[PDB]
């Protein structure tokens, strides 16, 4: 029920002349938008990515992002000139903005910035501020950025008003894709280990909440290890479970919302 909307921006500055900015947008774990450096326009990656916004509303929202990217590129380049020779290229900025939707028609917004892979700056309330751990020289860039009242007013409007209003639109428009149920397929295998290591591969399930356990009849095997959730291309999830002998008797059981109650047990 709690969806987190994310605008992820990644910008690379190789030298004084070379630069690149690419963005991607996620509603939960489904990609909604993409904005390559090559493109002048933000792209839709779902039929419902525009949400409940009108065409005139979207264009107005896109225009300010277009102006933003150009301005962002120049502002960093000027800040490098301002900090030289204490900081120099190559430079990587990562930006993470959006809001988390909650029950009872409420939300909470965020804007987080990372420098050279480390979180340094957030937008909080009415101004930019540095987080604990950040180097002290950032006080000057932040001072200069906070001087820009218009940028501050816009970011406030985006985080407080525009983002939550937009996401509620997406949730209404993309209900079928967001509430989609995909059945997992399970297959078993073995590889030699430092006893043999039985592997239970589970693939093609949505949503992400899954339950995978090795079981000797009713007894749930304690030595079961869950791996990492790995993505598929067709927007489904992959996961493997391992148990560290005597294999005749135990089975990989999988619970999921898609199966409609009836779990699948797969015997060795």
């Amino acid at each position, epitope marked *: 029920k709690n969806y987190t909307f994310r605008c992820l921006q990644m910008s690379s500055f190789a030298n004084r002349s070379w630069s690149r900015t690419d963005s991607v947008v996620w509603l939960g774990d489904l990609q909604t938008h993409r904005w390559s450096n090559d493109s002048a326009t933000i792209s839709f990656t779902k039929p419902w990515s525009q949400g409940k916004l009108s065409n005139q509303q979207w264009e107005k929202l896109q225009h300010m992002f277009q*102006v933003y990217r*150009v*301005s962002f590129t*120049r*502002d960093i380049q*000027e*800040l490098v*000139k*301002m900090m*030289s020779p204490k900081e120099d290229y190559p430079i990587e900025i990562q930006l993470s903005a959006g809001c988390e939707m909650y029950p009872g028609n409420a939300s909470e917004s965020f804007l987080h910035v990372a420098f050279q892979g480390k979180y340094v700056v957030r937008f909080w309330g009415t101004s930019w501020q540095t987080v604990p751990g950040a180097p002290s020289w950032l006080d000057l860039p932040i*001072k*200069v*950025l*906070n*001087a*820009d*009242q*218009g*940028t501050s007013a816009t970011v406030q409007m985006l985080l407080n008003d525009t983002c939550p209003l937009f996401v509620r639109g997406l949730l209404e428009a993309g209900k079928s894709d967001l509430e989609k149920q995909e059945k997992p397929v399970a297959w078993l295998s073995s590889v030699p280990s430092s006893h043999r290591q039985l592997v239970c591969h589970v693939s093609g399930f949505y949503p992400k909440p899954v339950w995978v356990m090795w079981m000797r009849g009713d007894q749930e095997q304690q030595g079961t290890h869950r791996g990492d959730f790995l993505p598929n291309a067709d927007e489904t999830w992959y996961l493997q479970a391992t148990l560290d002998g005597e294999e005749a008797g135990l089975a990989c059981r999988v619970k999921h919302s898609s199966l409609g109650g009836q779990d699948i047990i797969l015997y060795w």
Partner: T-cell receptor
Amino acid sequence: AAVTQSPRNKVAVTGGKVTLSCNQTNNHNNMYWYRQDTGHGLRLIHYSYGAGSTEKGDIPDGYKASRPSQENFSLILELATPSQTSVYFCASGDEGYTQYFGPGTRLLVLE
Amino acid sequence: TQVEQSPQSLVVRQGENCVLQCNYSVTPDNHLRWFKQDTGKGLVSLTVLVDQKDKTSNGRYSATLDKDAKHSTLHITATLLDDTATYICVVGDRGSALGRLHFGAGTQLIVIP
């Protein structure tokens, strides 16, 4: 919030060194050198984000810039040419957008 | 250029009003400033407009700004001899020190007493 310039008015010859100075006691980090010519807006030559650093403006050729301290920003014409006969304005500012302009300096380069 | 002023020059009689235009293509356009410059003199700030649809007043001077139209006007009410000067439109592309000012070539005003 005053910005001073010296000299106010200068006559120089082709090939000589010509140094135009600018001074502000406003503790402003940022200083900018412009030139004004008829039928043109003011055009940025050089600017400085702080002591011991200069950055190229839109029309930097022929000029070198020096920021010895917070207070002073200098425009240095090593080999002065007639094409540098102009009015030169200096300006300073803090983190805000306002640039505070000096009185202007009139340079004329004769053969 | 990115900042264009109109007319190039004009001559008015004492006590007549006049309107000076500014048109620009500057992106972004944070604020717009009108300067008065006497012959052989420096730059005196008359007003600075800031909003999307803005209007300002400074005695006999008043100015409008329309950011959608990227357009500004300077009205001088009941002109005097002292108004004989060049009037300069300037667009700043940021609301901070990171910005660059974009200057118009100016409009010459001559008032006949």
